């Protein structure tokens, strides 16, 4: 499925992910797309931070969902 | 009507409110339900942050609406 991740600066990145893919898979996709390390990225879905062990289906992430990416130092 | 509030931990809180009820009443209900003070709570729904001087009908909040709660430190 196609998903969109928005950062705090307004930049939106489109990725191809599956519902069974974990949040770590989304972090790896974002690292491939932009170069941000997975440990420096925080993913939020529906106002709640997504866990790396949990998947997109566990977080009820559907097609064309809007995830939130937060940078960390 | 019944409304849903999503927290950062994934817990969903169901609240009984009316369209004429202000966001201050919703903050008081959230304080009665979870103990979070109204000064440290921010409500986000339909692309706009909830204002204390506005009502649910002004924000076009209908039955079974899903808003998000953000806790300030």
């Amino acid at each position: 499925m196609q998903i969109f991740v928005k950062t705090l600066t307004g930049k939106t990145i489109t990725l191809e992910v599956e519902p069974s893919d974990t949040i770590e898979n989304v972090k790896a996709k974002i690292q491939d797309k932009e170069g941000i390390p997975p440990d420096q990225q925080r993913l939020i879905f529906a106002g709640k931070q997504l866990e790396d062990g949990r998947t997109l289906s566990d977080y009820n992430i559907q097609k064309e969902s809007t995830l939130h990416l937060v940078l960390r130092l | 009507m019944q409304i849903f509030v999503k927290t950062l931990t994934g817990k969903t809180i169901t609240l009984e409110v009316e369209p004429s009820d202000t966001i201050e009443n919703v903050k008081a209900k959230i304080q009665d339900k979870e103990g979070i003070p109204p000064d440290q709570q921010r409500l986000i729904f339909a692309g706009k942050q909830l204002e204390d001087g506005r009502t649910l009908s002004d924000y076009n909040i209908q039955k079974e609406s899903t808003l998000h709660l953000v806790l300030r430190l």
Binding site: K6, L8, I44, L67, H68 | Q49, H68
Partner: peptide, 29 residues
């Protein structure tokens, strides 16, 4: 929206980072 919440959570995240920098500048000097 989720973008609004992202910007807000980044706002308190940067505020926590700046308080950490305050503590740093406290005891390095």
């Amino acid at each position: 929206s989720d973008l609004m919440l992202a910007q807000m959570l980044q706002m308190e995240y940067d505020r926590e980072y700046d308080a950490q920098l305050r503590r740093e500048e406290k005891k390095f000097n």
